[PDB]
Amino acid sequence: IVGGYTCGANTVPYQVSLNSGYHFCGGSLINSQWVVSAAHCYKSGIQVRLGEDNINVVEGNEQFISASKSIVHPSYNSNTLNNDIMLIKLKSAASLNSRVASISLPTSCASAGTQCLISGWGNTKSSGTSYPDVLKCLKAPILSDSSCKSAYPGQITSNMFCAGYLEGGKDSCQGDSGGPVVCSGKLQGIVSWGSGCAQKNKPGVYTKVCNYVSWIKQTIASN
């Protein structure tokens, strides 16, 4: 997160860290046994880390649970990032509490101009790199279709939306990838892609979760 703020310990209790020996992506806890992340975050050997603030220090509210299964969206295209969503099933149920909590799935898609919360442990610089220890947050509005498509001509599908600031300096970035965009208390976006980070006229692009809730519900009902 570039240009954001320190969230505050466990104030984003659905935020997870995905760890394969190191933090590599975020995710969102949607019930005690399932995480939503980005398909481009796929890899083997994932451990889900819940209840984190400083990812490099055991502070006492963590739960570390290995993934039993990862399920990439059947129509994910890594070239276009169309359908950039994955489900991760935990080997055991998380114990839900004030600091580890699920976020609701949408029943309606979010509106342009809605102010959302984006969070993660990704890069905090727009050029170069600096990776934080504690969770960072950004408030950002959903942009119009017109602005999103003009920013990224021929690349925005109906399964994507833009959020952030066309003027630059405030965005998500690699390492936030796979993490939440929460709007009105629902998981509406997944950190997916963009050109650099926090560049003028190149806002963040987010997987449009509301398009996937049928697939999510059916998949978790059978796995």
Ligand X SMILES: Nc1c(Br)c(C(=O)O)c(Br)c(C(=O)O)c1Br
Least separation, in Å, of the C-beta of 102 and Cl ion?
34
CA distance 88 to 16: 11
Q: Beta strand 15-19 with 47-50: parallel, antiparallel or unpaired?
A: antiparallel
- The single residue among 32, 59, 112, 219 that binds Ca ion, judged by CB under 5 A, is 59
* Chosen from Cl ion, ligand X, Ca ion, none, partner binding at 59 (C-beta under 5 to 8 Å by type): Ca ion
CA atoms of 155 and 76, how far apart (whole Å): 15
Catalytic residue selected from 40, 73, 102, 192: 40
Q: In whole angstroms, what is the distance from residue 40 CA to residue 9 CA?
A: 27
Size of site (CB under 5 A) for Ca ion: 3
| Residue 146 sits in the site that holds Cl ion (CB under 5 A) | yes
Per the structure block, which two tokens stand in for 15? 């935020």
40 part of the active site: yes
Q: Could you tell me the smallest distance in angstroms from the CB atom of residue 181 to ligand X?
A: 12
Positions that interact with ligand X (CB under 6 A): 106-108, 110-111, 114, 183-184, 186
Contacts of residue 123, defined as CB under 8 A and 6 or more positions apart, other chains included, come to 2, 129, 130, 131, 173, 174, 175, 176, 197
What's the one-letter identity of residue 216? I
Q: Which stretch in 5-13, 47-55, 87-95, 130-138 sits in contact with Ca ion by CB under 5 A?
A: 47-55
From Ca ion, Cl ion, ligand X, none, which one binds at residue 89 (CB under 5 to 8 Å depending on kind)?
none
Q: Is 133 a catalytic residue?
A: no
Q: How far is the CB of 215 from Ca ion (least distance, A)?
A: 32
Tokens standing for residue 219: 């998949």
